[PDB]
Design a binder for this molecule. Structure first.
Ligand SMILES: CC(=O)N[C@@H]1[C@@H](O)[C@H](O)[C@@H](CO)O[C@H]1O
Ligand SMILES: CC(=O)N[C@@H]1[C@@H](O)[C@H](O)[C@@H](CO)O[C@H]1O
Ligand SMILES: CC(=O)N[C@@H]1[C@@H](O)[C@H](O)[C@@H](CO)O[C@H]1O
Ligand SMILES: CC(=O)N[C@@H]1[C@@H](O)[C@H](O)[C@@H](CO)O[C@H]1O
Ligand SMILES: CC(=O)N[C@@H]1[C@@H](O)[C@H](O)[C@@H](CO)O[C@H]1O
Ligand SMILES: CC(=O)N[C@@H]1[C@@H](O)[C@H](O)[C@@H](CO)O[C@H]1O
Ligand SMILES: CC(=O)N[C@@H]1[C@@H](O)[C@H](O)[C@@H](CO)O[C@H]1O
Ligand SMILES: CC(=O)N[C@@H]1[C@@H](O)[C@H](O)[C@@H](CO)O[C@H]1O
Ligand SMILES: CC(=O)N[C@@H]1[C@@H](O)[C@H](O)[C@@H](CO)O[C@H]1O
Ligand SMILES: CC(=O)N[C@@H]1[C@@H](O)[C@H](O)[C@@H](CO)O[C@H]1O
Ligand SMILES: *[C@@H]1O[C@H](CO)[C@@H](O)[C@H](O)[C@H]1NC(C)=O
Ligand SMILES: *[C@@H]1O[C@H](CO)[C@@H](O)[C@H](O)[C@H]1NC(C)=O
Ligand SMILES: *[C@@H]1O[C@H](CO)[C@@H](O)[C@H](O)[C@H]1NC(C)=O
Ligand SMILES: *[C@@H]1O[C@H](CO)[C@@H](O)[C@H](O)[C@H]1NC(C)=O
Ligand SMILES: *[C@@H]1O[C@H](CO)[C@@H](O)[C@H](O)[C@H]1NC(C)=O
Lengths: 99, 269, 426, 204, 39, 50, 49
């Protein structure tokens, strides 16, 4: 009888530890990502588009949270616009000028 | 659907319910992966009727109402990749919705540069979007304009070579084809394992119940339950590991969408 | 759904709760056209028998045991069974089928008992000391015996003659009068496998020969070779069969089944729900058909909205305006024609700062399990048995400790990138 | 004398239809390119079961006997083609030691221009017979090609077999072995090619 | 809950995490990116 | 008796192969990171702080 | 390498083959990891002397 309970409880606990190894690898992927967000967007200013929130990145502030982290990504977002006529270059004394 | 077996499986308790929960997590992960890659654009941008992109020719990669709406290259790609209680489930986004996002992303990328990630899409002429991408690699933009047709001919020609590279061999799509084959191989392995005896008198469940009286049949069926259940735990463990491997690829593809389509990543290679 | 989640409150979502599974509507049994029956009339309609001092014994093998005909033969002068009964023996089978017969007086019921006794039994007509099967007798004194009698008597092992034959006559009393004794006993000979009519396009229970199952039997175009009986699919599951009574090939398609999933707004907001029958065709079950299955109790709405509860294949559901559950094709976002032309650029005149929150997990709950206490708490008896499995509890506790130390590493990797604890200015 | 068996002697392993599929089984088969003994008769061993074939046009090769003694002492198979069809008996035949057709008992039954091919195997108490027929060009040996043998009869007779012999113009004998095979079933449910997995490293 | 299952505390307390997020934040405000790249 | 040893050894070997699959994902995550460092940090100059 | 044991191990079916296949998957992937990391260069460059 006890061989059945041991084999069952042990197969059940191996299932739990297998779940937790795979879940821990998912949380490590998220912790390495969070570490990277912190190095690039708190300690720096990232040029990686949409890596630190939508908009062009300015800075970010970390805040702690239970079992995790929150970033407040401060981003410049352009917000009103005008249509204009444009040209890639302009002539002057036969020479082409570029911006 | 054997009741005699089904009662014995209740004695193993929550094993079935946590296997179903584990697989249901993997099902949600696929809709989530597909959302995070493609749904990076809040509005379905649509292609202009005029096509005067300074000489560049996207007609192979833009939509086609005669093709579902998929582009010519998306039709090549869709051609070259190719009941025992198991069920497949549909994706949340059908291929006709994925095609609307890859159209929106592409029509944003063509008409408006990186700007459609940073905010509202701002139109800019394509010959000017390339100047403000040559400056992004430290080539002074006059090196575009003094060569605009020469650069266009190389781009249009290289797009033509991609049609040939994909039309001639499926080997470039080997990753996608392998991902499909791996899943089919896991499912075939899981179905074939119903035929294995696991030290029981027969792998036909009704055959045991015909040969034997109940207390003998109970022990024989308990072996089949143990074997099949261990085969299920094996399959689900393997699919959880495989799902993490695809999710790592989905996070990378989502990052290539964000930096590499919606921008100009300076990350070498 | 409440019982599925073991909770009275249910959050907004979609939940699998049961299997839809069409039950067999009736049961089918099929075998070959019944043929090569046992010629039991070679004993049970014989004109006479050899005397009990020389009683006959024979095989009864390689033929189908038509015992249902002898079971209806209530006009038999006598009948009995001991190793079986006549209600089951017409469906039973014999491993080495056999028969016997003799001519004897009506007192020979004493010769039918195992280890038989009396003059015919002591002569040769006796039953085995551990006898089996069934016994019969036929009315010889009615017409097989003339008024002068016949050699249907004997005096002192089965069918072994220390013995001699004698006369008996139809003018005698019922125990002295002659009768034609018969026997049958225990592969060699099996009773007829009765068949039903065949039924198609319904979910049905079936057996063909010994190929049991349940399925939707449909006529099929496949070309079996004449010796082939069963088909299989690529994964070796049976896909078709040959019928044993007409040369028809039937696809055994499955009986319809799928997950029942319940769409619900949160129970805090409503107690109305809508049910998705996964990959069912609605005729089999408001009602709405989708590529994901049959959706019941959701109103189809022809407009499109952002996806509230995801159903699949572009369908989503929500609770909306009197309110009810609706299902609709999801919006991907509003359309936008970017106003491109070869000489137009849009430059922003103004901006907004935005402060986009982003949220990331960094640690699990650090956990450890004493596998000796979990598996065997307080029991020395169980703890000793756990040691027969060797390294497993050591390996489990090691693996969890690996995760536990990794959580502190994760937390330091994120936050401890800074060498000094900078105070603010005042 | 001996000849090469080539890819011949494959037979339908079970009474099952399968289509467009590369099914695989371990069963008693004649190994690919095995030595088949050539003959133009002595009592032969039966071993793990027999492949037998004859290049024939006179139909003078006419019957087979099988058993342990294959003569007098015990119930022994006698199989004859009698110009109606196959005829079968299993009596304790104390008959003539080398019969020719004119130029106790427990069971009985009734059913060069060509190569006619056969397999005889004994499993669990069933005796199995298979066959195939073809026209031919080659006279000295089996023609190099592929064509699977089909079941004829399936007899529950329970008799022991360790020897066999043939009754009275050229024929071939080989022995089955517990080889694993890959079998190519086509669109129409016929075996059309095979691999003897044990043959060479490419076959594995 | 007594069944050999145990939850173990983190090495850093939540107050120590709040000192690191304070340090990171006070660095970020007073000194920009410079506090990552050395002094 | 042998079926107990097969049951035990097979479950033990499945534990080992399950553990090695998870470990190979940890190593492949490190190899993709290492390849990314070689592409961005050797083959080029990276502005990605730390 | 016992026949009497292997005859029982066959009754467990595909487990042993998918273990050999899983470990062969690990094995090939190490040669890939090493070529992903180091084989980023189309030619074997050499310094001046
Ligand atoms: C596959 C493809 O690109 N086909 C086009 C065709 O539609 C077009 O009519 C022709 C002339 O421009 O050039 C080519
Ligand atoms: C294959 C190729 O590149 N051909 C071009 C040719 O079209 C161009 O006219 C010339 C200008 O110098 O340079 C070369
Ligand atoms: C076992 C057997 O042969 N029974 C037959 C019976 O079916 C038939 O009806 C009768 C003549 O009427 O002769 C006897
Ligand atoms: C396979 C076969 O021969 N089936 C026959 C069927 O054709 C015939 O109509 C019927 C008459 O009862 O008996 C059975
Ligand atoms: C967190 C949440 O959903 N709370 C709601 C509450 O705001 C609402 O007034 C009530 C109506 O039944 O249902 C519950
Ligand atoms: C429930 C409902 O409104 N269904 C309609 C459908 O009858 C119509 O054919 C279609 C045309 O676009 O629009 C939708
Ligand atoms: C005993 C026997 O049959 N031996 C033959 C041998 O004579 C032949 O040369 C060889 C060629 O593979 O095959 C085998
Ligand atoms: C041709 C034939 O069947 N002969 C057999 C004989 O060999 C056997 O010894 C005898 C046993 O009763 O029965 C008869
Ligand atoms: C079914 C049958 O008669 N089987 C016999 C077996 O009992 C006997 O021990 C063996 C000796 O070689 O020959 C065979
Ligand atoms: C590849 C093959 O063998 N195809 C044949 C087909 O040519 C034939 O017309 C049919 C007759 O039933 O059977 C199948
Ligand atoms: C720019 O001009 C076009 C008409 O030429 C118009 O459709 C578009 O909406 C305008 N965009 C803005 C931001 O005013
Ligand atoms: C674009 O290229 C395709 C072939 O690649 C051709 O059919 C089409 O005419 C071209 N259009 C322009 C504007 O170059
Ligand atoms: C089965 O489903 C299809 C759509 O997938 C539908 O057209 C058809 O009418 C349904 N069949 C029946 C018998 O209801
Ligand atoms: C820019 O936007 C702000 C509101 O965000 C507004 O008060 C300000 O006047 C705008 N500037 C111009 C030049 O329109
Ligand atoms: C073949 O054998 C049967 C009896 O088994 C017999 O009736 C028939 O006449 C025989 N054939 C010939 C051509 O004699």
């Amino acid at each position: 009888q006890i061989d059945r309970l041991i084999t069952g409880r042990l197969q059940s606990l191996q299932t739990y530890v297998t779940q937790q190894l795979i879940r821990a690898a998912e949380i490590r992927a998220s912790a390495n990502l969070a570490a990277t967000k912190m190095s690039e967007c708190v300690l720096g200013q990232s040029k990686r588009v949409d890596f630190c929130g939508k908009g062009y990145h300015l800075m970010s502030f970390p805040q702690s949270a239970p079992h995790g982290v929150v970033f407040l990504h401060v981003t410049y977002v352009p917000a009103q616009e005008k249509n204009f006529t444009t040209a890639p270059a302009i002539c002057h004394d036969g020479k082409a000028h570029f911006p | 659907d054997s009741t005699e077996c089904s009662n014995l499986l209740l004695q193993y308790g929550s094993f079935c319910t946590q296997l179903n929960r584990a697989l249901t997590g993997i099902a949600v992960e696929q809709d989530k992966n597909t959302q995070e890659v493609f749904a990076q654009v809040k509005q379905i941008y649509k292609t202009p009727p005029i096509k005067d992109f300074g000489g560049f020719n996207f007609s192979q990669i833009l939509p086609d109402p005669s093709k579902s709406k998929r582009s010519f290259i998306e039709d090549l790609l869709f051609n070259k990749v190719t009941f025992n209680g198991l069920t497949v489930l549909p994706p949340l986004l059908t291929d006709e919705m994925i095609a609307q996002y890859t159209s929106a992303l592409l029509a944003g990328t063509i008409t408006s540069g990186w700007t459609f990630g940073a905010g509202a899409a701002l139109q800019i002429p394509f010959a000017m979007q390339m100047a403000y991408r040559f400056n992004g690699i430290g080539v002074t933009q006059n090196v575009l304009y003094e060569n605009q047709k020469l650069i266009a001919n190389q781009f249009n020609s290289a797009i033509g070579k991609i049609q040939d590279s994909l039309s001639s061999t499926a080997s470039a799509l080997g990753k996608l084809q392998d991902v499909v084959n791996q899943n089919a191989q896991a499912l075939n392995t899981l179905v074939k394992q119903l035929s294995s005896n696991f030290g029981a008198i027969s792998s036909v469940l009704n055959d045991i119940l015909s040969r034997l009286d109940k207390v003998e049949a109970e022990v024989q069926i308990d072996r089949l339950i143990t074997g099949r259940l261990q085969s299920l735990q094996t399959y689900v463990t393997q699919q959880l590991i495989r799902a993490a491997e695809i999710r790592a690829s989905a996070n990378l593809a989502a990052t290539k969408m964000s930096e590499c389509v919606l921008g100009q990543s300076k990350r070498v290679d | 759904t409440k019982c599925t989640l073991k909770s009275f409150t249910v959050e907004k979502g979609i939940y699998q709760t049961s299997n839809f599974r069409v039950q067999p509507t009736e049961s089918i049994v099929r075998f070959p056209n019944i043929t090569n029956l046992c010629p039991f009339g070679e004993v049970f309609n014989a004109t006479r028998f050899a005397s009990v001092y020389a009683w006959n014994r024979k095989r009864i093998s390689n033929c189908v045991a038509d015992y249902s005909v002898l079971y209806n033969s209530a006009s038999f002068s006598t009948f009995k069974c001991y190793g079986v009964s006549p209600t089951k023996l017409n469906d039973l089978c014999f491993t080495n089928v056999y028969a016997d017969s003799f001519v004897i007086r009506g007192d020979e019921v004493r010769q039918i008992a195992p280890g038989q006794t009396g003059k015919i039994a002591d002569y040769n007509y006796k039953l085995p000391d551990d006898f089996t099967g069934c016994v019969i007798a036929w009315n010889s004194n009615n017409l097989d015996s003339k008024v002068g009698g016949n050699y249907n008597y004997l005096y002192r092992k089965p069918f072994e003659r220390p013995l001699q034959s004698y006369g008996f006559q139809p003018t005698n009393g019922v125990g002295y009068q002659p009768y034609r004794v018969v026997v049958l006993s225990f592969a060699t000979v099996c009773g007829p496998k009765k068949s039903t009519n065949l039924v198609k396009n319904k979910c049905v229970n079936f057996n063909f020969n010994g190929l049991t199952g349940t399925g939707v039997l449909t006529e099929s175009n496949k070309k079996f070779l004449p010796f082939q009986q069963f088909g299989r699919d690529i994964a070796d599951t049976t896909d078709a069969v040959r019928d044993p009574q007409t040369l028809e090939i039937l696809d055994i398609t499955p009986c319809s089944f799928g997950g029942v999933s319940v769409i619900t707004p949160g129970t805090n907001t409503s107690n109305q729900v809508a049910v998705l029958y996964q990959d069912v065709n609605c005729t089999e079950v408001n009602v709405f058909q989708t590529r994901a299955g049959c959706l019941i109790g959701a109103e189809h709405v022809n407009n499109s909205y952002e996806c509230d509860i995801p159903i699949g294949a572009g369908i989503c559901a929500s609770y909306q305006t009197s309110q009810s559950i609706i299902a609709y094709t999801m919006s991907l976002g509003a359309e936008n024609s970017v106003a491109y032309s070869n000489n137009s650029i849009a430059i922003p005149t103004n901006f907004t700062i935005s402060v986009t929150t982003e949220i990331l997990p960094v640690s699990m709950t650090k956990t450890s399990v004493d596998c000796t206490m979990y598996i065997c708490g307080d029991s020395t008896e169980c703890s000793n048995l756990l040691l027969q499995y060797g390294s497993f509890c050591t390996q489990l506790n090691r693996a969890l400790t690996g995760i536990a130390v990794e959580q502190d590493k994760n937390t330091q990797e994120v936050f401890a990138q800074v060498k000094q604890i900078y105070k603010t200015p005042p | 004398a001996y000849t090469n068996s080539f890819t011949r002697g494959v037979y339908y392993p079970d009474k099952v239809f399968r289509s467009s599929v590369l099914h695989s089984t371990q069963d008693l088969f004649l190994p690919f390119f095995s030595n088949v003994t050539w003959f133009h008769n002595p009592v032969l061993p039966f071993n793990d079961g027999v492949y037998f074939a004859s290049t024939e046009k006179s139909n003078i090769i006419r019957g087979w006997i099988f058993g342990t003694t294959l003569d007098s002492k015990t119930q022994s198979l006698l199989i004859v083609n009698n110009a109606t069809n196959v005829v079968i008996k299993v009596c304790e035949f104390q008959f003539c030691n080398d019969p020719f057709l004119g130029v106790n008992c427990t069971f009985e039954y009734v059913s060069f221009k060509n190569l006619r091919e056969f397999v005889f195997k004994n499993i669990d108490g069933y005796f199995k017979i298979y066959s195939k027929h073809t026209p031919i060009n080659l006279v000295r040996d089996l023609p190099q090609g592929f064509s699977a043998l089909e079941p004829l009869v399936d007899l529950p007779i329970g008799i022991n077999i360790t020897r066999f012999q043939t009754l009275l113009a050229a024929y071939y004998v080989g022995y089955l072995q517990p080889r694993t095979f890959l079998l190519k079933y086509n669109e129409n449910g016929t075996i059309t090619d095979a691999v003897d997995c044990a043959l060479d490293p490419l076959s594995e | 809950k007594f069944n050999g299952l145990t939850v173990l505390p983190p090495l850093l307390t939540d107050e120590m995490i709040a000192q690191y997020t304070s340090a990171l934040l006070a660095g970020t405000i007073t000194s920009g990116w410079t506090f990552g790249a050395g002094a």
